Target: Collagen type I
Amino acid sequence: PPGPPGPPGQRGERGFPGPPGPPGPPG
Amino acid sequence: PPGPPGPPGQRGERGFPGPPGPPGP
Amino acid sequence: PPGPPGPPGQRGERGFPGPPGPPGPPG
Model:
């Protein structure tokens, strides 16, 4: 018979960091 | 015969927050 | 006997990009 199904793939790499935050409050 | 390929891996974890924004005008 | 185990799954896709950072410092 056909062999067992292969093991599940590894979890992908972590996503990239997000964009810079909103500009600070005007003094 | 060999088994079929395993399922694709889960999507990676979401990235970390970005850096603090630029200083006030 | 049953065949050899299947190939491993492909590694997952990269995660989604992160959220925006905190708001900037004041003036």
